[PDB]
Amino acid sequence: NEAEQNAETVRRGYAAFNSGDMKTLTELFDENASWHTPGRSRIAGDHKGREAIFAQFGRYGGETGGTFKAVLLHVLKSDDGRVIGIHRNTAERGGKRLDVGCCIVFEFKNGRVIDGREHFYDLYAWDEFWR
Template sequence: MFAMFAMFAMFAMDFELSGGTYRPQLRDVLANDDHTVALLHATAERAGKRLDMDCVIDFRIRNDRIVEGSEFWAEPSEYDEFWS
């Protein structure tokens, strides 16, 4: 359960840091008993920069609870530059 709260806290921080412009759009979900994978597209503006990028979030599931979440951005260096 902690991983799920951490992921939502991260979304809240992204929203705050982008002045309310962060917009993750869910494109698809793939799931089985061990993993749920969300395919997203996110946009945001911050300090004259624009984010417009695909992302995959992989949630690992154990005993019907999210125990870990990992993000994979299409262009990690561009994503890091946006938030720097």
């Protein structure tokens, strides 16, 4: 089904993110996708356009000496093809350590991601790390 194909695409995307494989990661996102990062840090906001998403992703890895990881724990689906990834983000940056849980809500258009929205459990921890 559609919903499981979208789940497969999410799994492929976490793997490609974690390995820095931005060529695969491209295939999986619509060129007009958005990415929504909550909170009050310098990397918060609505990043509109796949190019703006991948700049965000580049800051995630860039600013942590490539230590930033998304450890995927569970993948959930709606019958209509929405997908959530539950994960933990870990990373190091200037003597600080990140370890926070997150649910990303993925919306799809024609099998590609059109929207991703991060929901961190301890948003304060994320913001503290990025301060």
